[PDB]
Design an enzyme around this catalytic site. Structure first.
Site, PDB file in Angstrom:
ATOM      1  N   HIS A  40      -4.693   4.934   5.100  1.00 52.92           N
ATOM      2  CA  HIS A  40      -4.476   6.244   4.465  1.00 52.92           C
ATOM      3  C   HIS A  40      -5.079   6.297   3.054  1.00 52.92           C
ATOM      4  CE1 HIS A  40      -2.070   9.517   2.603  1.00 52.92           C
ATOM      5  NE2 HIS A  40      -2.574  10.109   3.685  1.00 52.92           N
ATOM      6  N   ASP A  41      -4.828   5.242   2.281  1.00 55.26           N
ATOM      7  CA  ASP A  41      -5.368   5.177   0.909  1.00 55.26           C
ATOM      8  C   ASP A  41      -6.915   5.226   0.993  1.00 55.26           C
ATOM      9  OD1 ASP A  41      -2.891   4.792  -0.135  1.00 55.26           O
ATOM     10  OD2 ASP A  41      -3.259   2.695  -0.874  1.00 55.26           O
TER      11      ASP A  41
ATOM     12  N   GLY B  74       2.669   3.914  -1.278  1.00 62.67           N
ATOM     13  CA  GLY B  74       3.192   4.200  -2.639  1.00 62.67           C
ATOM     14  C   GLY B  74       1.978   4.230  -3.588  1.00 62.67           C
TER      15      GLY B  74
ATOM     16  N   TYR C  62       0.747  -1.242   0.000  1.00 59.78           N
ATOM     17  CA  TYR C  62       0.000   0.000   0.000  1.00 59.78           C
ATOM     18  C   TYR C  62       0.782   1.302   0.000  1.00 59.78           C
ATOM     19  CZ  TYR C  62      -4.209  -2.780   0.164  1.00 59.78           C
ATOM     20  OH  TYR C  62      -5.225  -3.690  -0.149  1.00 59.78           O
TER      21      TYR C  62
ATOM     22  N   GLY D 297      -0.919   3.278  -5.851  1.00 55.80           N
ATOM     23  CA  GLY D 297      -1.748   2.077  -5.771  1.00 55.80           C
ATOM     24  C   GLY D 297      -1.749   1.431  -4.386  1.00 55.80           C
TER      25      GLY D 297
ATOM     26  N   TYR E  21      -8.266   8.790   1.623  1.00 50.42           N
ATOM     27  CA  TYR E  21      -8.329   9.603   0.412  1.00 50.42           C
ATOM     28  C   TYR E  21      -9.547   9.246  -0.467  1.00 50.42           C
ATOM     29  CZ  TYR E  21      -3.778  12.005   0.935  1.00 50.42           C
ATOM     30  OH  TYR E  21      -2.710  12.805   1.350  1.00 50.42           O
TER      31      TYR E  21
ATOM     32  N   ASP F 187      -3.893  12.671   6.640  1.00 51.42           N
ATOM     33  CA  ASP F 187      -2.423  12.745   6.630  1.00 51.42           C
ATOM     34  C   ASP F 187      -1.841  12.666   8.047  1.00 51.42           C
ATOM     35  OD1 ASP F 187      -1.815  15.001   3.770  1.00 51.42           O
ATOM     36  OD2 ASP F 187      -2.588  12.885   3.891  1.00 51.42           O
TER      37      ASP F 187
ATOM     38  N   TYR G 152      -4.289  22.246   2.355  1.00 51.49           N
ATOM     39  CA  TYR G 152      -4.571  22.518   3.770  1.00 51.49           C
ATOM     40  C   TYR G 152      -3.321  23.058   4.487  1.00 51.49           C
ATOM     41  CZ  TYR G 152      -2.027  18.133   4.726  1.00 51.49           C
ATOM     42  OH  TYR G 152      -1.051  17.135   4.814  1.00 51.49           O
TER      43      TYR G 152
END
Ligand SMILES: [Ca+2]
Length: 123
Positions: free
Chosen positions: A48-49, A30, A28, A32, A52, A99, A73
């Site tokens: 995190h992915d 990076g 995960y 993709g 988003y 983040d 932000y």
């Protein structure tokens, strides 16, 4: 955006160079991200992915036609603590928190160098 995120990781892990250490780790971390995460750090990146993707569904972000990757932000770092700015709008605030949570996660889990630059065929 990337410049703030890299800054947040450095705020929590001052010994790191995030673009070198955290890019291309596991399934995960990076571009993709697919398959089962290989370790807890990879699960940080998986969360995190997913953060988003979620931001992209927020009405606030959609009407602003925002891209989480380019989101501007504001944040601050003092004494290795990250604060997302109160001035952030709803969408920018959501991205900052994605983040922030990831940077804290990164700082709380082991780093398994054997998982760096994994062949995606294991994902
Ligand atoms: Ca990813």
């Amino acid at each position: 955006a990337l410049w703030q995120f890299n800054g947040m990781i450095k705020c929590k892990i001052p010994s790191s160079e995030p673009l070198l250490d955290f890019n291309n780790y596991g399934c995960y971390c990076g571009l993709g991200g697919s398959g089962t995460p290989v370790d807890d750090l990879d699960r940080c990146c998986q969360t995190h992915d997913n953060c988003y993707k979620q931001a992209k569904k927020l009405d606030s972000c959609k009407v602003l036609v925002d891209n989480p990757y380019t989101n501007n932000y504001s944040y601050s770092c003092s004494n290795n603590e990250i604060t997302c700015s109160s001035e952030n709008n709803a969408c920018e605030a959501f991205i900052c928190n994605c983040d922030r949570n990831a940077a804290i996660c990164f700082s709380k889990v082991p780093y398994n160098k054997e998982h760096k630059n994994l062949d995606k065929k294991n994902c």
